[PDB]
Amino acid sequence: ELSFGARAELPRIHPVASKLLRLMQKKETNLCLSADVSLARELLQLADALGPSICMLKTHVDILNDFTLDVMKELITLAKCHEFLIFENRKFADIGNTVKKQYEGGIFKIASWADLVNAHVVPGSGVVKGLQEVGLPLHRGCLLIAEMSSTGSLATGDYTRAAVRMAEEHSEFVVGFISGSRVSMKPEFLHLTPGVQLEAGGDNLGQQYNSPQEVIGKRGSDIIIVGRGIISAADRLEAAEMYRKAAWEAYLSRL
Amino acid sequence: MELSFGARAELPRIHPVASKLLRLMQKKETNLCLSADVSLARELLQLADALGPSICMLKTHVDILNDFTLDVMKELITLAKCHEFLIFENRKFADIGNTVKKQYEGGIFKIASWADLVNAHVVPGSGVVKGLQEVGLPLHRGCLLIAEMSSTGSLATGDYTRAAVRMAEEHSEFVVGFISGSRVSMKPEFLHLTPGVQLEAGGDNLGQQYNSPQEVIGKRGSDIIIVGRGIISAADRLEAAEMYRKAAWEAYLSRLG
Ligand SMILES: O=C(O)c1cc(=O)[nH]c(=O)n1[C@@H]1O[C@H](COP(=O)(O)O)[C@@H](O)[C@H]1O
Ligand SMILES: O=C(O)c1cc(=O)[nH]c(=O)n1[C@@H]1O[C@H](COP(=O)(O)O)[C@@H](O)[C@H]1O
């Protein structure tokens, strides 16, 4: 088991992964905030106030009612100031020819501002080869969805193994996984885990929660992704700190 | 028994959106869905106007449309009503239920406001359908589940495809069919829509694989062909659409008997 700082220096490490691992060690946070808010002002307010506490901010551009590329310019400034990466939520999950345009184009131009994107592996490896065409020139990274947190997920067994092989064979662009646990034994890959709350439970639409201790400590993942656990709290600053402190200590303990 | 689209439109358990589709298919003799992955609204609208009479559906790619406004979608709706086709947005809904409802309803695009049909990947489990349904049900919208894919290395096989079929059958108030390479359900109320179709053999350099209208409709038992590059790359996109329409329509007539 290597520290985040050491992993950032691995020969085969991807630049985006290195930058992330560095800032994680520096700031003592392996917490990614999921900010699914409908107003640009809310997104920017949250990112400024919680920026110190997070390694990464998961955006949801598809639901921002007043998206503009200027908002993203401003977000990037915050990102650079507080030191966190930007991970857009959009689930790329089409054939390679189509995902390329989805990633680069349209009103959102996701590749022009997102350090990280995620893709589903269901279409086969063409999904990654397509993204890569746009992502590599722009010096970007990609996470593959190897497992999901929701009830009835089909991202199990051979599907998960297929995800891991895909990542390992496209390591110039793929830097990690969305998963519920460690799924790759190569320490160059990041594991990011959604479906995280301090308390037991779920939501009324299939979400299932596990704690930071369970996911980071017992299941060997690297980063927790938390949305409602923080956003719905009365004091969001305090919430983000509780989740950061939880995940960080689980990591240290594993070391 | 094989039934005509017109007959299927009258099936007891048929969804209103499926029935509207099936009836215009029969009336217009077309089971062709144009995939218009273009970056400009003028091209989209010009294609929708010129090919409108030849298609039963238009697959939009709003994420790629550089000059999207809701007013463009307003004009598309006009053309869809005039020429009689449904609007099917390509966006792959593939998140947990709570998240997909906002993606469908909201943001700048407000996809549920103008799309007759959406598609979802089934990998998140049935939550993905429940979330979409909370928005789309009152709007008489329908959902297609992605049961199989046309690309090399597709994981939508075996138990995965079966899970897709079961999910649709258990949510038939909202799920109206499949994206698939063949008939995957025996229930005639469900539509089968097949991408990866060109008149000529081949593929692309990023994993796409093609089969002909004759194969997919006639031998594999699908209902509708989805075609992008086969039409969009032609000099004459109207001529090309007519060729695909006649191919798919005759293939359907063949298995009808
Ligand atoms: O991409 C993800 O992180 C995602 C996949 C998954 O398997 N589970 C999952 O919860 N998500 C997303 O992670 C976030 C979890 O948010 P909360 O449940 O509010 O903490 C939401 O944006 C989900 O859409
Ligand atoms: O969502 C789809 O229809 C999709 C699934 C699939 O398995 N295969 C597939 O080709 N598609 C889409 O269908 C269209 C095919 O385009 P052409 O390959 O240009 O005919 C594109 O919009 C693809 O993204």
Curated annotation (Swiss-Prot), chain B:
Keywords linked to the UniProt accession: Acetylation, Decarboxylase, Disease variant, Glycosyltransferase, Lyase, Multifunctional enzyme, Phosphoprotein, Pyrimidine biosynthesis, Transferase
Function comment: Bifunctional enzyme catalyzing the last two steps of de novo pyrimidine biosynthesis, orotate phosphoribosyltransferase (OPRT), which converts orotate to orotidine-5'-monophosphate (OMP), and orotidine-5'-monophosphate decarboxylase (ODC), the terminal enzymatic reaction that decarboxylates OMP to uridine monophosphate (UMP).
Binding site for orotidine 5'-phosphate: S35, K59, K92, D95, T99, S150, Q208, Q209, Y210, G228, R229
The name this protein goes by in its record: Uridine 5'-monophosphate synthase
Amino-acid positions noted as binding UMP in the UniProt annotation, renumbered to this chain: S35, D37, K59, T60, H61, D95, T99, S150, Q208, Q209, Y210, G228, R229
Catalytic activity: orotidine 5'-phosphate + diphosphate = orotate + 5-phospho-alpha-D-ribose 1-diphosphate; orotidine 5'-phosphate + H(+) = UMP + CO2
Family according to the record: In the N-terminal section; belongs to the purine/pyrimidine phosphoribosyltransferase family. In the C-terminal section; belongs to the OMP decarboxylase family.
E.C. number: 2.4.2.10, 4.1.1.23
GO cellular component: cytoplasm; cytosol; nucleus
Organism: Homo sapiens
Active site: N90 (for ompdecase activity), K92 (for ompdecase activity), D95 (for ompdecase activity)
Residue numbers of the full-length protein present here: 224 to 479 of 480
GO molecular function: identical protein binding; orotate phosphoribosyltransferase activity; orotidine-5'-phosphate decarboxylase activity
Subunit (UniProt): Homodimer; dimerization is required for enzymatic activity.
A biological-process GO annotation: UMP biosynthetic process
Pathway: Pyrimidine metabolism; UMP biosynthesis via de novo pathway; UMP from orotate: step 1/2; Pyrimidine metabolism; UMP biosynthesis via de novo pathway; UMP from orotate: step 2/2
Segments forming a coiled coil: none
Disease affiliated with this protein: Orotic aciduria 1: A disorder of pyrimidine metabolism resulting in megaloblastic anemia and orotic acid crystalluria that is frequently associated with some degree of physical and intellectual disability. A minority of cases have additional features, particularly congenital malformations and immune deficiencies.
Annotated segments matching region OMPdecase: 2-257
Superkingdom to which the source organism belongs: Eukaryota
